[PDB]
Scaffold this active site. Structure first.
Site, mmCIF file in Angstrom:
data_model
loop_
_atom_site.group_PDB
_atom_site.id
_atom_site.type_symbol
_atom_site.label_atom_id
_atom_site.label_comp_id
_atom_site.label_asym_id
_atom_site.label_seq_id
_atom_site.Cartn_x
_atom_site.Cartn_y
_atom_site.Cartn_z
ATOM 1 N N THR A 47 6.054 29.762 82.404
ATOM 2 C CA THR A 47 4.967 29.337 81.675
ATOM 3 C C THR A 47 4.605 28.051 81.484
ATOM 4 O O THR A 47 5.640 27.254 81.143
ATOM 5 C CB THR A 47 4.514 30.007 80.458
ATOM 6 O OG1 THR A 47 4.601 31.586 80.432
ATOM 7 C CG2 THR A 47 3.477 29.631 79.494
ATOM 8 N N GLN A 48 3.626 27.101 81.820
ATOM 9 C CA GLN A 48 3.526 25.828 81.481
ATOM 10 C C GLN A 48 2.004 25.478 81.026
ATOM 11 O O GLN A 48 1.189 26.342 80.890
ATOM 12 C CB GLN A 48 3.794 25.086 82.933
ATOM 13 C CG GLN A 48 4.391 25.577 83.922
ATOM 14 C CD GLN A 48 3.563 26.460 84.819
ATOM 15 O OE1 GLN A 48 2.588 27.074 84.479
ATOM 16 N NE2 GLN A 48 3.757 26.112 86.215
ATOM 17 N N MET A 100 5.982 34.951 85.649
ATOM 18 C CA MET A 100 5.515 34.285 84.713
ATOM 19 C C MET A 100 5.702 32.725 84.771
ATOM 20 O O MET A 100 5.916 31.950 83.765
ATOM 21 C CB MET A 100 6.250 34.828 83.277
ATOM 22 C CG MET A 100 5.936 36.291 83.016
ATOM 23 S SD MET A 100 3.988 36.520 82.823
ATOM 24 C CE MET A 100 4.108 35.813 81.140
#
Ligand code: 39V
Ligand code: MG
Ligand code: MG
Lengths: 240, 233, 211, 222, 235, 195, 244, 231
Positions: free
Chosen positions: B1-2, B107
């Protein structure tokens, strides 16, 4: 890891390592198993080359796997401990996952499977051990007696012997043991087990071990004096 | 996730009778800061495909390299690399779509919205969309970000359904695209006047136009607008 | 859901409803909440539908393998334990599965309650699901060991009906099973709409409801 | 925070006849209040006389269908080109879904075809793999709008025979393919009116012993 | 020494060829396929009279519709049977159906060549896999440690195999009944066995569509042996 | 589960454990035996999170039974309690700890003495004349502090235990459905069927 | 490949013997003799250092007798380096047991554990076995005083009196002759030294060529004391018994 | 001699004997023929039985809708290699929406077989394969040897007595290549080619196995009464 294939086929279709493991069993002390009508008896030879031995603490030849099953053997002593430990672990593992103690047939099948696994796994040699596994299934009064060997084959026996001079005591059992009418009592069953060992043992002093297993987890080991009385009675009848 | 950092805005496209058109501005935004003014977001793959990318620029540059490496790899032990076994738009898209959906399933997405425009071996038009979620769809007109809200309505007036495609010429389609880019410049706060446009035609091949500007803008009416209600001066 | 199961003189009764929900929405009017593991073993289902189906069908795989290895049918006690052990592997991972393992083996009729926490309980009577409280009311006041097969089947049927009526997330139809030493016996699908009016008239119950 | 899921709207409908089955679905694809495509096929011929539709999050739906189509291919390789029966496909799909019990395929899945006795069959799934054979099922955005209509018009629920006054039910007479297609088209026209994610087009796949046939019908584009 | 997966100059794997020699030393097992069912019979060969012969389990159930007989190093068969049973029930889990006899056999034969320097050697046992499915009907397969499996109308494996196979060559025809096949297995077993055939040292079994896989009682086999003796004395 | 009590008298250890098992708002069972025999002269009662309790107890039981068979010898209550403590202390720093509190009542045949060990889920062991887990001690320890002597008979131990249960039944909000009482002495383990 | 150079340490001979175990036993037969004698009130451990030098620092030297814990000790016959590997493992096992059960490890359990490690090297791993034979002298409250021996095969047995290393055949005959069941520690000390003095390959048995130890309940009240004899103390007991 | 104990050992003349022994297993195997035109590609295989009670061992395996092969040698090794092809054909479809090129399929088989010829412990594959297929550049026929060598050919044959069929195809080259849009005539040429490798035995109904792939023809296998037409 060490992956070397030690147990392999030879041109004539033999696995020599498994066959040489049987030779180790041939060297081992004699063990005998006889099942009566309501009991099983396990007899074991103790070689009298070793005196000054402490019989209290010396590993006994017959080992309890659970409260209702026992295991005796012939062959390499150190190898037998590994099978016994694994068997004892599996016995508790079965009670834990299925809520019933192992049957004698199941326990035998497991021990035999371990022996087989060591004949086609890399980097390991076969167990130089043959076992006699005896007992009574939970809530059952029918006696059980099984035999295993290094190759991993197993089978049920009315009476059987393994180890050195087993050929002789098997010869005795084959003519003395009647299937239609097996040893009705404990006495008759033990007497026949002692008689069979007296064909091979040498002296009937501390060389014979007897373990009687009865239904409902009733397992006892006979003492020297109790066995000595059987030895006395047998030879006195023989003098005729 | 970013989170996306340096970003590219709308990519718009449409089908016409003999091919596809795709366009995208040359801006790389850093939040509200219009940081980079020379960013090419249309990336040709061979002479039959153009991939238009919006969203995170660092992830765009990564995808740009994947496609460059894809062409190299396709040529390996391939005597027909510039002919029958050349890369097709459908091959390039499905590759990207596979990558996008795998990354979202770990993810760790590529924070992009991609439109693959091109012409197949048999002359068929190819136009398909894929994004950071691995969601894919195709339509006579496709657009990302603000383009979806403002460009599609204009482009759908030209090609409202499949049967309008053969009736639409390249001049009409290009005109619609150029008008849409002007509308986006009026109304998208993260757009630039400078843009690139690519046409992939089954006859004339790939035409790549750089350094295009939005022109013919209407601002004169602003002089008359005074205050926010009651003010006259 | 509402499920129940109880031991009695002539074996064990198992009764379940047939509703399925997705919030206030009734997603299914007729789901099967009993699994026929083998001719002498049943499993009830309550909780997450997917979990119930997957794990109880995996139990059936494992119970079948037991028969092949041992040449003999698995006990109800052992079957329930295999299932409870499966639940302990996914301990705290968010499964939702409440079940009764009903059957007949060498010890006679058997009944075990198993849930997603790995709980395993032996007993004469159980009821799981959102409407189990309503079922327990009827069961507790009418249950005997000396019940006839006919009266026992009706009790389980009537107990589900009670729950179907009051519990919003229970209803649709009633599925009945009767487990004997010759195996389980299916006693049909009974629509609650029709059953309610029938029971109301014949029994005189549900006086407050107008019909 | 990154949300790996999305909602592409749409609605699907499966009805089982006596010797046929239908699987229908609208062709509209959406995100939020925007239209992605007015024609994006959602119901697929998977081979072996089986049709499938995974409705909800399109990315997961396409992945599932792609995987099942692959499962059919490998079933032929491994089992001597044996035909995959509808009941066997259903069970296979259960395991495909439950493989992601802790990161689910966000889809409502329906398959349709014929059972091994030649009768019409529909199977319905939830996102985590629970399934069952059904006579009638609507799935997706407007599922709650359509299902009650089907309970009434397919299974004749709450319908009794005049004169008896609630004593005798309407008998469960079977429906023809022509009658079913009418109920499908009226179901989608009604759903299109009252649901904003439903519209543009309707594609119906009909399954018989002769094979798989397609029918397309326009819907309102607003 | 030499590799376990080594080719001979003739193009054969030494170890596979040597395992075949071990199978030749094994007790005889015979299978006969008919349109009414497949019959499986074995020589028990007890090494001593004190050995309880009913504990000799050389015929084994894999599934309700598939049975299996073995010959050679029978201890090696246990893991193969375990895999077969697992494969059969696992397929039932994934596909809600019975598994094809061929597919089951193929799954067993995939284990065969998984040896090297995986298990350390090939299996020293051959299997006769008999069963029924809806697609191909009654089937009999011969699974070897080479990984190869042939389908057979009739097949004998073990020490008296070539003599029994020559006898099966003449006796088998496509219109055999189940009863005729039963007597035929008993006849050929009696011919190749060292000791005199009876219900205690020989075992029968069959697989039918209706009743599935069944091992025959010693009382049931004894009658078939008595029926055999009388029909041979009839001419 | 809820309440487990223990008391060590002159020549025995008495363990009392509640019979109730609750899921949601329903009491599923009112005859549950919250105990396992670890060896002929060692009994362990338990209480804690659902499922974990039985799994832990059975796992301990299996290990002690394995030891008994291997050595043909019964471990002392002290040795068993130390083994159990280590398993709980090992467990508390695991990914998912076993949330189980136990009492171990045993008769040491070597020393001819009864022994009661209290161990909580953290691995906190204490040897005590009487013990409890959770809220049980809040109600009962004042009675035990008052009435307990070390020379008490088994019958006097049961009478003092009845008084403790009566106090619990009066002042606890929860209905724990009475207790199953078991006695551990030189002759082994037996259950008091009327309490 | 590598197979060419593999000696195959874990295989049976045609006769059913383990080559490497048998050859390890042959190695051990050349090692200095170690003797253990169990009495009613204690255990004696006596062992002969191999051809020493005058420049060897004896008081800080230890090649034969090692302490496993406060209750258990061992006499070594074979490769000293191999023995130290096993000894350190046994020391850890005893401490693991003490930590787990809060009781000192029973002698047999420790012996079985070490013997199982030796067994493993004969059945798997492809490594040479440990060329070591142990005499275990220990005490616990179950069986009291105990003597055991283990060898490279991993087989162990219990004894009243036993020898390992060189001249065990001769040594065992002498022990079998003079040993009695009602024997005491002071008598056993004398028997051990007399047996070594007759079996030794050296010209004369001296203090500098011996290691000696006793395990006695001769500690103040119900407890056990280990006594590893110092060079001067071995010299005194040699004079006392009338050997020098 | 001294250099044939394993695959990791060159002989003094630079030969790999284990690979050559694996090649020998193919020569012992039953004959199979491959040939193609510009539109279609055909496999013809002589199946072998154990005895009269036994079935005839299958020789042809399908890899995809557009590709498949015939085997000669160790059948289990063909199952492994064909399974690998099935996966590679399938990877190309699922990832790139692209039918795997027959030439690339050959390159993948070459590389897979090669790894087994250079490493210790393993062994070379003991089977030869004839791969046919129809892709974007038309019909194709490949010959795979377990040395790793893969060769694209107009026609070929492998197995026992394969030299006879190979000579026939070498004469017929100009004729059968021109058989376009006529599957039956191309099969006839293959059946006539494999007949040149027969001795004593002849082509019966359960003996012969044929496969074909082409422009508008998926890879299909013909066995039993389906090949009686060509006998
Ligand atoms: C009561 C009706 C409601 O609690 C009962 O518990 C049923 C049990 C049941 C068992 C087997 C099969 C079907 C139902 N439970 C449900 O219906 C659950 C309740 C529930 C919703 N969310 C949730 C629940 C339970 C625990 C945690 C979270 N409902 C479901 O699982 C939903 C998701 N199932 C469906 O929507 C299904 C559909 C649609 C469908 C199913 C299940 C099965 C076959 C065809 C279609
Ligand atoms: Mg609108
Ligand atoms: Mg505490």
């Amino acid at each position: 890891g060490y992956d070397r294939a030690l147990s392999i086929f030879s041109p004539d279709g033999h696995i020599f390592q498994v066959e040489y493991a049987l030779e180790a069993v041939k060297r081992g002390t004699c063990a005998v198993g006889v099942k009566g009508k309501n009991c099983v008896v396990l007899g074991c030879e103790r070689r009298s080359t070793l005196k000054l031995q402490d019989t209290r603490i010396t590993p006994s030849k017959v080992s309890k796997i659970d409260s209702h099953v026992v295991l005796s053997f012939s062959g390499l002593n150190a190898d037998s401990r590994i099978l016994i430990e694994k068997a004892r672990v599996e016995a508790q593992s079965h009670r834990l996952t299925l809520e019933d103690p192992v049957t004698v047939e199941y326990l035998t099948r497991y021990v035999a499977g371990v022996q087989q696994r060591y004949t086609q796994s890399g980097g390991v040699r076969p167990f130089g051990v043959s076992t006699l596994i005896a007992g009574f299934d939970p809530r059952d009064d029918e006696p059980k007696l099984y035999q295993t060997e290094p190759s991993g084959i197993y089978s049920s026996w009315s009476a059987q012997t393994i180890g050195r001079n087993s050929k002789t005591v098997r010869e005795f059992l084959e003519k003395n043991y009647d299937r239609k009418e097996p040893p009705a009592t404990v006495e008759e069953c033990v007497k026949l087990t002692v008689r069979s060992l007296l064909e091979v043992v040498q002296t009937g002093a501390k060389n014979i071990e007897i373990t009687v297993v009865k239904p409902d987890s009733d397992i006892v080991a006979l003492s020297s004096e109790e066995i000595n009385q059987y030895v006395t009675q047998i030879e006195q009848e023989k003098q005729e | 996730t970013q989170q996306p950092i340096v970003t590219g805005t709308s990519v718009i496209s449409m089908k016409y009778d003999n091919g596809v058109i795709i366009a995208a501005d040359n801006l790389g935004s850093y939040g509200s800061l219009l940081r980079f003014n020379g960013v090419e977001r249309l990336i040709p793959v061979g002479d039959n495909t153009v991939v238009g990318i919006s969203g995170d620029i660092s992830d765009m540059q990564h995808i740009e390299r994947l496609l460059k490496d894809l062409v190299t790899e396709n040529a390996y032990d391939n005597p027909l690399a510039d002919a029958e076994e050349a890369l097709e738009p459908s091959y390039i898209f499905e590759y990207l779509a596979t990558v996008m959906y795998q990354r979202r399933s770990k993810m760790n997405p590529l924070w992009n919205a991609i439109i693959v425009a091109g012409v197949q071996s048999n002359g068929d038009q190819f136009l398909r969309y894929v994004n950071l979620l691995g969601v894919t769809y195709s339509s006579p007109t496709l657009a990302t970000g603000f383009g979806a809200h403002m460009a599609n309505p204009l482009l759908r007036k030209v090609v409202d359904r499949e049967s309008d495609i053969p009736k639409t010429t390249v001049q009409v389609a290009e005109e619609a695209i150029v008008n849409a880019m002007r509308v986006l410049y009026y109304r998208d706060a993260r757009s630039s006047r400078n843009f690139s446009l690519a046409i992939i035609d089954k006859n004339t091949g790939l035409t790549f136009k750089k350094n295009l500007q939005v022109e013919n803008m209407k601002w004169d009416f602003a002089k008359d607008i005074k205050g926010y209600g009651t003010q006259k001066i | 859901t509402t499920t129940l199961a109880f031991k009695f003189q002539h074996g064990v009764i198992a009764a379940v409803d047939s509703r399925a929900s997705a919030g206030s929405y009734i997603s299914a009017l007729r789901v099967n909440k009993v699994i026929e593991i083998n001719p002498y073993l049943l499993g009830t289902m309550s909780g997450c539908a997917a979990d119930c189906q997957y794990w109880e069908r995996l139990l059936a795989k494992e119970c079948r393998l037991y028969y092949l290895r041992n040449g003999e049918r698995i006990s109800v006690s052992a079957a329930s334990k295999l299932l409870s052990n499966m639940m302990c592997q996914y301990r705290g991972m968010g499964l939702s599965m409440g079940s009764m393992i009903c059957g007949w083996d060498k010890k006679g009729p058997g009944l075990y309650y198993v849930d997603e926490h790995g709980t395993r309980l032996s007993g004469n009577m159980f009821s799981t699901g959102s409407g189990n409280t309503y079922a327990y009311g009827v069961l507790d006041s009418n249950y005997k060991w000396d019940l006839s097969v006919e009266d026992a089947l009706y009790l389980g049927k009537r107990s589900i009906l009670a729950a179907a009526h009051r519990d919003a997330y229970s209803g649709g139809s009633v599925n009945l099973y009767h487990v004997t030493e010759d195996g389980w016996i299916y006693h049909g699908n009974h629509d609650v709409g029709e059953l309610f009016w029938k029971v109301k008239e014949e029994e005189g119950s549900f006086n407050n409801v107008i019909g | 925070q990154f949300n790996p899921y999305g909602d592409n709207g749409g609605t699907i409908l499966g009805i089982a006849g006596e010797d046929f089955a239908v699987l229908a679905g609208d062709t509209r694809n959406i995100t939020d209040y925007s239209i992605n495509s007015r024609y994006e096929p959602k119901v697929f011929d998977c081979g072996d006389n089986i049709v499938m539709s995974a409705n909800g999050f399109a990315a997961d739906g396409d992945a599932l269908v792609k995987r099942f189509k692959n499962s059919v291919k490998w079933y032929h390789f491994d089992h001597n080109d044996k035909k995959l029966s509808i009941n066997s496909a259903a069970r296979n799909i259960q395991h495909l879904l439950y493989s992601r019990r802790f990161f689910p395929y966000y889809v409502y899945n329906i398959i349709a075809g014929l059972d091994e006795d030649g009768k019409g069959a529909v199977y319905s799934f939830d996102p985590v793999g629970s399934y069952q054979r059904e006579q009638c099922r609507a799935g997706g955005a407007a599922a709650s709008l359509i299902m009650p209509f089907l309970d009434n018009q397919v299974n004749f629920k709450n319908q009794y025979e005049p004169g008896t006054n609630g004593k005798v039910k309407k008998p469960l007479k079977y429906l023809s393919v022509e009658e079913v297609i009418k109920l499908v088209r009226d179901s989608f026209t009604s759903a299109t009116e009252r649901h904003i994610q439903v519209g543009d087009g309707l594609e119906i796949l009909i399954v018989t012993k002769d094979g798989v046939r397609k029918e397309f019908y326009e819907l309102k584009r607003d | 020494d030499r590799g376990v997966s080594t080719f001979s100059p003739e193009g054969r794997l030494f170890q596979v060829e040597y395992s075949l020699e071990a199978i030749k030393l094994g007790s005889t097992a015979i299978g006969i396929a008919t349109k009414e069912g497949v019959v499986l019979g074995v020589e028990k060969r007890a090494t001593s009279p004190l050995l309880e012969s009913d504990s000799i389990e050389k015929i084994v159930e894999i599934d309700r519709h598939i049975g299996c007989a073995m010959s050679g190093l029978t201890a090696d068969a246990r893991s193969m049977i375990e895999h077969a049973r697992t494969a059969a029930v696992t397929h039932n889990l994934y596909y809600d159906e019975d598994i094809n006899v061929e597919s089951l056999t193929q799954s067993v034969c995939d284990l065969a060549l998984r040896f090297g320097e995986l298990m350390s050697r090939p299996f020293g046992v051959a299997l006769l896999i008999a069963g029924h499915d809806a697609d191909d009907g009654y089937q009999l397969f011969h699974a070897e440690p080479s990984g190869t499996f042939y389908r057979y109308n009739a097949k004998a494996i073990g020490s008296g195999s070539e003599g029994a196979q020559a006898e099966l060559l003449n006796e088998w025809h496509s219109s055999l009944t189940l009863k005729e096949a039963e007597l035929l297995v008993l006849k050929i077993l009696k011919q190749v066995m060292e000791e005199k055939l009876d219900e205690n040292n020989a075992q029968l079994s069959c697989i039918t569509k209706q009743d599935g896989f069944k091992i025959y009682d010693n009382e049931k086999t004894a009658e078939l042996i008595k029926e055999l003796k009388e029909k041979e004395a009839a001419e | 589960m809820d309440i487990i009590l223990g008391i060590r008298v002159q020549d025995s250890v008495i363990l009392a454990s509640s019979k109730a098992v609750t899921r949601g708002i329903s009491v599923l069972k009112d005859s549950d035996d919250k105990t396992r025999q670890l060896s002929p002269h060692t009994l362990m009662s338990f209480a804690g999170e659902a499922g974990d309790t039985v799994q832990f107890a059975e796992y301990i039981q299996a290990n002690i039974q394995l030891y008994s068979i291997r050595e043909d010898y019964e471990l002392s209550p002290q040795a068993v309690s130390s083994f159990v403590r280590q398993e709980l202390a090992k467990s508390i720093r695991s990914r998912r700890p076993y949330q189980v509190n136990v009492l171990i009542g045993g008769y040491d045949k070597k020393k001819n003495k009864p022994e009661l060990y209290q161990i909580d889920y953290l691995g906190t062991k204490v040897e005590l004349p009487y013990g409890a887990h959770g809220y049980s001690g809040f109600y009962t320890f004042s009675l035990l502090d008052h009435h307990y002597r070390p020379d008490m008979t088994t019958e006097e131990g049961l009478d003092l235990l009845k008084l403790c249960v009566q106090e619990l039944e009066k002042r606890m909000p929860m209905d724990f459905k009475g207790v199953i009482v078991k006695i551990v002495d030189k002759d082994g383990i037996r259950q008091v069927d009327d309490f | 490949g590598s197979r060419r150079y593999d000696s195959r340490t874990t295989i049976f001979s045609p006769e059913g013997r383990l080559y490497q175990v048998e050859y390890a036993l042959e190695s051990i037969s050349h090692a200095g003799t170690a003797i253990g004698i169990m009495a009613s009130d204690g255990i004696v451990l006596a062992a002969e250092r191999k051809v020493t030098s005058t420049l060897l620092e004896q008081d800080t030297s230890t090649e034969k007798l090692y302490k496993l814990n406060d209750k258990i000790a061992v006499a070594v016959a074979g490769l000293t380096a191999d023995a130290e590997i096993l000894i350190n493992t046994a020391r850890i096992h005893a401490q693991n047991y003490l930590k787990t059960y809060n009781e000192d490890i029973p002698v047999e359990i420790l012996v079985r554990r070490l013997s199982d490690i030796k067994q493993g090297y004969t059945q798997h791993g492809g490594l040479r076995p440990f060329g070591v034979s142990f005499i275990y002298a220990g005490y616990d409250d179950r069986y009291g005083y105990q003597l055991y021996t283990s060898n490279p095969s991993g087989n162990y047995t219990g004894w009243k009196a036993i020898s390992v290393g060189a001249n065990t055949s001769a040594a065992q005959t002498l022990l079998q002759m003079d040993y009695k069941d009602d024997m005491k520690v002071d008598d056993a000390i004398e028997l051990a030294l007399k047996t070594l003095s007759k079996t030794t390959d050296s010209s004369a048995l001296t203090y500098d060529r011996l290691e000696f130890a006793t395990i006695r309940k001769g500690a103040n009240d119900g407890e056990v004391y280990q006594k590893i004899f110092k060079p001067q103390e071995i010299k005194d007991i040699l004079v006392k018994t009338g050997i020098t | 001699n001294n250099y044939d104990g394993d695959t990791v050992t060159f002989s003094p003349t630079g030969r790999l004997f284990q690979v050559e022994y694996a090649l020998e297993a193919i020569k012992q195997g039953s004959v199979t023929v491959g040939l193609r035109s510009n539109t279609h590609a055909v496999l013809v295989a002589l199946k072998r039985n154990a005895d009269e009670l036994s079935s005839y061992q299958k020789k042809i395996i399908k890899c995809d809708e557009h590709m498949g092969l015939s085997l000669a040698g160790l059948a289990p090794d063909a199952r492994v290699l064909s399974n690998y092809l099935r996966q590679q054909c399938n990877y190309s479809s699922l990832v790139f929406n692209r039918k795997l090129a027959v030439e690339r399929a050959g390159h993948l088989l070459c590389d897979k077989a090669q790894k087994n010829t250079q490493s210790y412990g393993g062994r070379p594959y003991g089977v030869g394969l004839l791969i046919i297929g129809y892709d974007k550049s038309g019909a194709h026929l490949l010959e795979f040897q377990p040395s790793g060598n893969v060769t694209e050919l107009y026609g070929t044959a492998i197995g026992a007595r394969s030299q006879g069929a190979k000579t026939y195809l070498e004469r017929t080259l100009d004729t059968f290549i021109k058989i376009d849009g006529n599957p039956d005539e191309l099969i006839k040429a293959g059946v006539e080619a494999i007949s040149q490798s027969l001795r004593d035995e002849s082509l019966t109904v359960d003996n012969l196995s044929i496969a074909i792939v082409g422009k508008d023809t998926p890879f299909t296998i013909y066995d039993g009464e389906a090949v009686a037409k060509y006998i």
